[PDB]
């Protein structure tokens, strides 16, 4: 299986209550290893996972320096955008940013990301060729012209391919016990009656990592995607993930339905009959 590393940063202005709050986190695949909160008294990058605190003070002081430089950059970006768009200073505004790289079962580069959003909408993003920028609006293309002239796309590509990947390959090593495990789901089925004329069949998947999974329902092999409720994939809190799918079926016909589960950790897809 391939792998990914991401850092997600959020900056929320709070007018009248002081300077914007900046939160940044980071992930290897679906596991978060770090945190920075601009309101925390620590003012340091912090370990969120048992395999990253084996790093030495050379790591944490250097990480801390870069994320706080990012923090003041995004804090100033909020005012530039506020002026770009002529928006009121009484409104709260949000700047989101994410970057990172993907690597394969080999360990070498696949793709990388450098991108920003403003009030939940795309602003400027590095194209997947990593040589050019997509820009949503007119204001973002000012930033595009400023960024193309200053050659930042060339420096970020150097980071994404060079530094991001080697740190990724290192974390996958420091933590290979937890990170490269794939736990298959524990799948079962529960039966909830409603009326005499109808009842609900629910198909569960529990304790699986990574989060990518597919649950589907079939009627006699006809794949019934109508009247099937399927919830978003929720974390269990111990590092694993959960999910379930359900169908309302007329009793007594529950025998004709089959749940279908596919996950990286399964040798072959599971099918379940009530």
């Amino acid at each position: 299986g391939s792998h990914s590393m991401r850092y997600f940063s959020t900056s929320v202005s709070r007018p009248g209550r002081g300077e914007p709050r900046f939160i940044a986190v980071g992930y290897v695949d679906d596991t978060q290893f770090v945190r920075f909160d601009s309101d925390a008294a620590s003012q340091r990058m912090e370990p969120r996972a048992p395999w990253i605190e084996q790093e030495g003070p050379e790591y944490w002081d250097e990480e801390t320096g870069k994320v706080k430089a990012h923090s003041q950059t995004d804090r100033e970006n909020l005012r530039i955008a506020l002026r770009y768009y002529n928006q009121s200073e009484a409104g709260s505004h949000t700047l989101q940013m994410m970057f990172g790289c993907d690597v394969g079962s080999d360990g070498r580069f696949l793709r990388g990301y450098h991108q920003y959003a403003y009030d939940g909408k795309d602003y400027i993003a590095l194209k997947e060729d990593l040589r050019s920028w997509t820009a949503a609006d007119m204001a973002a293309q000012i930033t595009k012209r400023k960024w193309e002239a200053a050659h930042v796309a060339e420096q970020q590509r150097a980071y994404l391919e060079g530094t991001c990947v080697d740190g990724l390959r290192r974390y996958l090593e420091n933590g290979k016990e937890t990170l490269q495990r794939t736990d298959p789901p524990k799948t079962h089925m529960t039966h909830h009656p409603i009326s005499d004329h109808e009842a609900t069949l629910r198909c569960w998947a529990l304790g699986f990592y990574p989060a990518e999974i597919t649950l589907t329902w079939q009627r006699d092999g006809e794949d019934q995607t109508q009247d099937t409720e399927l919830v978003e994939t929720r974390p269990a809190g111990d590092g694993t993930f959960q999910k379930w799918a359900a169908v309302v079926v007329p009793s007594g016909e529950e025998q004709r339905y089959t749940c279908h589960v596919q996950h990286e950790g399964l040798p072959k897809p599971l099918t379940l009959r009530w």
Partner: peptide
């Protein structure tokens, strides 16, 4: 490993 630009650059 977090990103670092030699000179930080804004919007």
């Amino acid at each position: 490993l977090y990103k670092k630009l030699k000179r930080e650059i804004t919007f």
